[PDB]
Design a protein around this ligand. Sequence first.
Ligand code: Q3D
Ligand code: Q3D
Length: 359
Amino acid sequence: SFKCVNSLKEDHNQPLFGVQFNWHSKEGDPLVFATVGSNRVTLYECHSQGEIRLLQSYVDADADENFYTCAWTYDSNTSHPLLAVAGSRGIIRIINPITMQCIKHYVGHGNAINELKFHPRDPNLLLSVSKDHALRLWNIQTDTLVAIFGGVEGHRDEVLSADYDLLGEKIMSCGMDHSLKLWRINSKRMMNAIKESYDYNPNKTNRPFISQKIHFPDFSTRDIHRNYVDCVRWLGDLILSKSCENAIVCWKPGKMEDDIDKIKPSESNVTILGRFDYSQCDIWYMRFSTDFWQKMLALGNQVGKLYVWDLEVEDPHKAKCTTLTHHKCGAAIRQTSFSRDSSILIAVCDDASIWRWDR
Ligand SMILES: CS(=O)(=O)c1ncn2c(NCc3c(F)ccc4c3CCO4)ncc(-c3ccc(C4CC4)nc3)c12
Ligand SMILES: CS(=O)(=O)c1ncn2c(NCc3c(F)ccc4c3CCO4)ncc(-c3ccc(C4CC4)nc3)c12
């Protein structure tokens, strides 16, 4: 079980909106996590006796920038870790975490980015989610925009979150329009788009890289929540999503026995496999997280309380809850992150504080 071993506060005193452990850190090396808040990204190293060692920050040139999200990947030739960050400016930055240098940046239409996720099987494929109602898939090896997920049947308002399934064959996105949309990326069209993005070398051709515009999702539902869906994650062939109604719903498209890969775009049914209720987390912009093995689920609330569900149960509705409190932790917990071995849980707050819980 978890015990709070340390806490700290960042100098800017602004909320921390994101935290991510590097699950790509090498064997023997200490555990490293990134935090995002104000116009800054900061790296910390976890040590024994609850020590958190401050490393280095990337500070944006624009004092008005607000970083909302960050994601770890690695260089496809050298295996060296890389960090992607984005926020209110709508600029994706790829940072070398060693020197904290921005090595490259991407701009779509330049509208705020709410979330970044790297493909689970391809370190080069970066998904961004935006306030401009679209999702974008980038190939950071060839610096190309592979596809835009939006359009005529896409999200009708700001996209807040998205997630890849286990194999990275499909994406589930959600947002302010109350819907959850499924986008299949193993279609012939998307497989060909990805292949072509790898074959693109502008020094070797005349054609622009031709990005796909995907106007139609493979499934859509507004039957789960009755407000903004601000967080989504796959749990195998199941979905975990939350709104600001003090609940994470575990559901699936179609009827109970319907296979996710036989689901058609016209599908009108959803099946609810359970709901995890909690308290005082009815404000927008609160993220839940799972550990690497998806044995645990974590979410913080508006008043500094942490909830942890044990998912190692036969059916989702049988999950066992544990609550984590500390008399000095009273600010809203915006995001949590587990280390790869799930031995450490970091929570980040509205008052720029960082809390370390060791298993
Ligand atoms: C070899 S490559 O450079 O083309 C390549 N390098 C990486 N590729 C990825 N990565 C994402 C990925 C994945 F790694 C695992 C599961 C998954 C996807 C996306 C949909 O389902 N996807 C697709 C491809 C890919 C491969 C082969 C083909 C056939 C020859 C025409 N088409 C597409 C790919
Ligand atoms: C400026 S804004 O309100 O339009 C905004 N626009 C986008 N914002 C994001 N986006 C990331 C995001 C998300 F899309 C969904 C879930 C999620 C977060 C981060 C933690 O949990 N996060 C936070 C915020 C946010 C919230 C509260 C406040 C101050 C303390 C009162 N300021 C900003 C945000």
